[PDB]
Design a protein around this nucleic acid. Structure first.
Length: 341
RNA sequence: UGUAAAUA
């Protein structure tokens, strides 16, 4: 199976092997773990000539290396460190196989690297090959990385077909493990005409989203990167429920982002909500203090409050200081207090 | 003291 040259090479019988010396053997070395490493080592610091010898032997069977556990790296190097004519020629090799490669464990790495390095003409061609399979890729463990890369590298206007697919399914997709990632990429890179319809569906399901294992990240993302108007719509869903949400494993992360990225007014009102609100005998603030998740919200409130309001929070915390020691998470608030005293 | 992505 292995040629004598590859066999002997593996037994380390060529300590000084040069790229030039494996002529006629590139495909086989490429498909071998050490040989492939060999080729990659030798490529970054190889003359364009030596690079072209290697290329002549991988072009025709390029696909075969794209979907091979060791061969895909050799192809990728050509997309990075290759030449503007070698990259184009490999794009040709991918043509008609974009879908199949984007779902492939190894090919999808080649599709990704190619999108970063090819011209927009070749990008827009790769993209269009996913026309009709947007959701299949978004949900696939390889494909969703390719769709993310498209959104990051390709002109937003050529991505309109992905948006079309997401319309009406934003809630479902935001609660999906890969879809929430793709949603986040769309908010970062897409045009208003595209992000707006998607933001409308997010606002419509904020309540459910903030408590969802994956949805909470999409809402956090908006708070961290969104327009003030989108932030405020979200902040308005949290107001009235600060105490409850801050005790939730997922939504508590969102409440924190609210506290952190809300406008001054919105922030003051959120912190005041639990300074003023009672939970039975004592403040909401106090119940939060003892909670495995809420204590983090309390601390974040202490962090970002305006100095005058920090005083208010301190005053509410002060009377419980001794009894805080008895509670597992209360203890952690004590730690935060040292800072401020 | 608390939550999410892929190859030797």
């Amino acid at each position: 199976g292995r040629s004598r040259l590859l066999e002997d090479f593996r037994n380390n019988r060529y300590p000084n092997l040069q790229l030039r010396e494996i002529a006629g053997h590139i495909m086989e070395f490429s498909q071998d773990q050490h040989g492939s490493r060999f080729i990659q080592l030798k490529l970054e610091r190889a003359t364009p000539a030596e690079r072209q010898l290697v290329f002549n032997e991988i072009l025709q069977a390029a696909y075969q290396l794209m979907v091979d556990v060791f061969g895909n790296y050799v192809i990728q190097k050509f997309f990075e460190f290759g030449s503007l004519e070698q990259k184009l020629a490999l794009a040709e090799r991918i043509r008609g196989h974009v879908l199949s490669l984007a779902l492939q464990m190894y090919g999808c790495r080649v599709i990704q690297k190619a999108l970063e390095f090819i011209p927009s003409d070749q990008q827009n061609e790769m993209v269009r090959e996913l026309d009709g399979h947007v959701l299949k890729c978004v949900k696939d463990q390889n494909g969703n990385h390719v769709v993310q890369k498209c959104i990051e590298c390709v002109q937003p206007q050529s991505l309109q077909f992905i948006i079309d697919a997401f319309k009406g399914q934003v809630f479902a997709l935001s609660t999906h493990p890969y879809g929430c990632r793709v949603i986040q990429r769309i908010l970062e890179h897409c045009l208003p005409d595209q992000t707006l319809p998607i933001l409308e569906e997010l606002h419509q399901h904020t309540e459910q989203l903030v408590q969802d294992q994956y949805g909470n990240y999409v809402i956090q993302h908006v708070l961290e990167h969104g327009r003030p108007e989108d932030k405020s719509k979200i902040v308005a869903e949290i107001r009235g429920n600060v105490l409850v949400l801050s005790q939730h494993k997922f939504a508590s992360n969102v409440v924190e982002k609210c506290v952190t990225h809300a406008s001054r007014t919105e922030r003051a009102v959120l912190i005041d909500e639990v300074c003023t609100m009672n939970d039975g005998p004592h403040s909401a603030l106090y119940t939060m203090m003892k909670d495995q998740y809420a204590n983090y919200v309390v601390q974040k409130m202490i962090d970002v409050a305006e100095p005058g309001q920090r005083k208010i929070v301190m005053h509410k915390i002060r009377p419980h200081i001794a009894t805080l020691r008895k509670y597992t998470y209360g203890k952690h608030i004590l730690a935060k207090l040292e800072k401020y005293y």
